[PDB]
Design a protein around this ligand. Sequence first.
Ligand SMILES: [Zn+2]
Lengths: 49, 48, 162
Amino acid sequence: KPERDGLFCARIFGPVKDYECLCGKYKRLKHRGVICEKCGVEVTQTKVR
Amino acid sequence: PPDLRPLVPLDGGRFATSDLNDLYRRVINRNNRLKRLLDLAAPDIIVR
Amino acid sequence: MQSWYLLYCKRGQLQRAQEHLERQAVNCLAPMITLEKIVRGKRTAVSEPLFPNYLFVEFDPEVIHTTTINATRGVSHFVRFGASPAIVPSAVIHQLSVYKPKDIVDPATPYPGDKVIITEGAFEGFQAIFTEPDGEARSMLLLNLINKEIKHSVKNTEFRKL
RNA sequence: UGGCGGUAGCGU
DNA sequence: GGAAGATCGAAAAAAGCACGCTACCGCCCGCGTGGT
DNA sequence: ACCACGCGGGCGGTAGCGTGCTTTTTTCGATCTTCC
Ligand SMILES: [Zn+2]
């Protein structure tokens, strides 16, 4: 998994899995566009990386 | 973007690192060292 | 006739380079500072070299050549600007020898009264407040959670500084 | 199941 | 009538060196550390 | 003794490593040569 503020950080570039938060609290298309507050990574498709 | 410089798994517990990632790591380390030494009131020669 | 030069040493080989240079009768200088705090814990407090990978050397080029110093074990390369190596003025050495060391702590990771994040633990992904570093590798922090804020003790490994 | 380098070969 | 623009050859730096395909090999930081 | 990582960077050395092209472009000692 990526680190924080690293060269691969999810907060900067995007989540590692499509419509799945890095934390894993939100893992569905319903939370699209919602930035999770525990880890600060937006729930979007992986292609945005 | 990270996808343009992927970390392809080697199927043996290791990760193949592209040259761009290594160069970026070098630049980041050098910049962090420069900031740390600037915060340390280092002499002019060391800062240069 | 003696001259001062700056040398960039290898990684973790400052002691070896200093010993080798002293074996060759070359004056050596490296700042010292009593400050050392990393994840390893177990009372890390010990002196560490200020301005890492830098070493000032006083010697006469006509006695010991610069190539011999460049080939000394532990020393990586001369700190050179242009073709010729840079010459450190004596005023800089004089001012750095005595009052350069300072008690100000540069690494803020062990200092209390800060804001940190936890990489892994009982409550992952929750910011914590550093207020008092009891002992070593024992960090009591005001972890914030939805149910209740808890003054919980976690290791230095558990939380990441800032 | 991804590339880099080297070597050898096929077709011009 | 000794200096300033011309140049002149001599030296130095840079870029390119056909395409497809096949097979093999090796390699995918690197050594100096820290707890056990 | 192994297992794991963590900051750095050409290497090992108490120096030196290179060593069979052609064409284009840039710069400069040095003349030169013309004259301000
Ligand atoms: Zn999340």
